[PDB]
Curated annotation (Swiss-Prot), chain A:
Organism the protein comes from: Homo sapiens (Human)
Quaternary structure (record): Interacts (via FERM domain) with JAKMIP1. Interacts with PIK3R1; this interaction is important for cell migration. Interacts with MPL/TPOR.
A GO molecular function held by the record: growth hormone receptor binding
Posttranslational mods: Phosphorylated.
UniProt name for this protein: Non-receptor tyrosine-protein kinase TYK2
Lineage: Eukaryota, Metazoa, Chordata, Craniata, Vertebrata
UniProt tissue specificity: Observed in all cell lines analyzed. Expressed in a variety of lymphoid and non-lymphoid cell lines.
Family membership noted in the UniProt record: Belongs to the protein kinase superfamily. Tyr protein kinase family. JAK subfamily.
Any one GO CC term of the record: receptor complex
Domain called FERM: residue spans: 1-343
Phosphoserine modified-residue sites: 411, 434
Swiss-Prot record, chain B:
Subunit structure: Heterodimer with IFNAR2; forming the receptor for type I interferon. Interacts with TYK2. Interacts (serine-phosphorylated form) with FBXW11, the substrate recognition component of a SCF (SKP1-CUL1-F-box protein) E3 ubiquitin-protein ligase complex. Interacts with SHMT2; this promotes interaction with ABRAXAS2 and the BRISC complex. Interacts with TRIM10; this interaction prevents association between IFNAR1 and TYK2.
Phosphoserine PTM positions: 7
Residues of the whole record sequence present: 489 to 507 of 557
Membership in a protein family: Belongs to the type II cytokine receptor family.
Region entry Important for interaction with TYK2, spans: 3-12
Organism: Homo sapiens (Human)
Protein name per Swiss-Prot or TrEMBL: Interferon alpha/beta receptor 1
Function description: Together with IFNAR2, forms the heterodimeric receptor for type I interferons (including interferons alpha, beta, epsilon, omega and kappa). Type I interferon binding activates the JAK-STAT signaling cascade, resulting in transcriptional activation or repression of interferon-regulated genes that encode the effectors of the interferon response. Mechanistically, type I interferon-binding brings the IFNAR1 and IFNAR2 subunits into close proximity with one another, driving their associated Janus kinases (JAKs) (TYK2 bound to IFNAR1 and JAK1 bound to IFNAR2) to cross-phosphorylate one another.
Effect of substituting residue 13 to R: Mildly reduces ubiquitination. Nearly abolishes ubiquitination and subsequent degradation
Involvement in disorder: Immunodeficiency 106, susceptibility to viral infections: An autosomal recessive immunologic disorder characterized by increased susceptibility to viral infections beginning in infancy or early childhood. IMD106 affected individuals may demonstrate adverse reactions to vaccination with live attenuated viral vaccines, most notably measles, mumps and rubella (MMR) and yellow fever vaccines. A subset of IMD106 patients develop severe reactions, including excessive hyperinflammatory response, encephalopathy, acute respiratory distress syndrome, and multiorgan failure.
Amino acid sequence: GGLKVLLHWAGPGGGEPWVTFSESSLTAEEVCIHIAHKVGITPPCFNLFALFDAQAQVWLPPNHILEIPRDASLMLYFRIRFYFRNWHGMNPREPAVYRCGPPGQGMQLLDPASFEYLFEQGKHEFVNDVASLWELSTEEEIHHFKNESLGMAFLHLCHLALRHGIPLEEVAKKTSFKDCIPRSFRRHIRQHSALTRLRLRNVFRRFLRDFQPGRLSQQMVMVKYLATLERLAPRFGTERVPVCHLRLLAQAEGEPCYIRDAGPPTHEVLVTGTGGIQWWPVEPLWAYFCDFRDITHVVLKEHCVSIHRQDNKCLELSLPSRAAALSFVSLVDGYFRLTADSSHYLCHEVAPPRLVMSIRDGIHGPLLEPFVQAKLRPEDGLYLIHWSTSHPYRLILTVAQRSQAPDGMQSLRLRKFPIEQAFVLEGWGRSFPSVRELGAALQGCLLRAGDDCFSLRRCCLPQPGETSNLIIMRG
Amino acid sequence: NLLLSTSEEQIEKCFIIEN
């Protein structure tokens, strides 16, 4: 009965942690935008999210065509895919992360709803062994992991107490610490001694007694939980991709992915927001390939991927399937968008449809006010179109007006007009097929707002590598 | 502080003169 997309959080208001889609065909992007909006996620945060196929263990590229009834049996989760370790800035041993600030706040990576979704997703991955007890060897590491997992289960229940507005003791009786710890630790407890069970129960009941009502807020419990999860789980917020073949090649010595007239994994390629692209064979050490800003393009031919660096060196990869190659290319392309270029994509095979449209129609992403001002200020008659920073389906046509700030010093006043979709500008009797068509008609015309007039002389276009709040700066 | 503040555009009613 339709495509059921699973949620880790239903957003404010709540309800069923899923969204069912009945439309004959939809893109993965349309799905994510619809869900992001329902959950309260804002437009500057939309591109952090993607759809994960939990059974096939692949993510969908944003141009993936979902079809109903054909895909009614797919098990998909809506999740944060693009992650920056230490974004909260709680580990001093690693750099900070922020959105570009105004020229010469809006610098925070996440909005309130993206943070709460991240926390709910983190709890799911934690319980699902993103950090396994089995991966440990020494008594010191095992003891630390168990004690930390109990502290995490304590934070999990404290949050629930605050969220539902009930004391910690009534939460502790409805929810067990065993349901808030990694599954590998839960299995360990069950298989081990009855006296060890009694002891862990008493250690946890003690953790509950050292709780102070009014000491911490819901937000502080969440940040600490997430920051502890990062410390416990080095794999959390990262992706390790298995490949069947891996080669490094210099371009002026051969063509990669060449058409010629699958096997067990030989390597893993690691991709992280703060560390770029690394690899290792399956004594172990991650070799470094490049950062996202070093990539010129990515070539995808069947299940074969080629990552091209500016110096013409290539990382050639054979993935287990076409769906695995599309998952992988959309991971590299998604981090490239966030760290290097808001208005470019590395491979047409996985390009976000809303971005392809934006590039051809000369539309900017959800830019904050100081970035649009820096674009309109050079000349009179300048204008631009950008996606709204609050509304997912609204475009903003913007002009700058002569104004006088307090002191008598000449200032700049912005006038914002909405374009809605068959794109229509609110106040103009015409209707257009594309925004490029609506913008081409706009060229040379005169805009009237109250008693003021504005010459629509030139449309500012997105420039390659230009900094804005859409760019994520790695400290 | 930790999180992205809301930013809604104040939008206005248009009128276009052609040629």
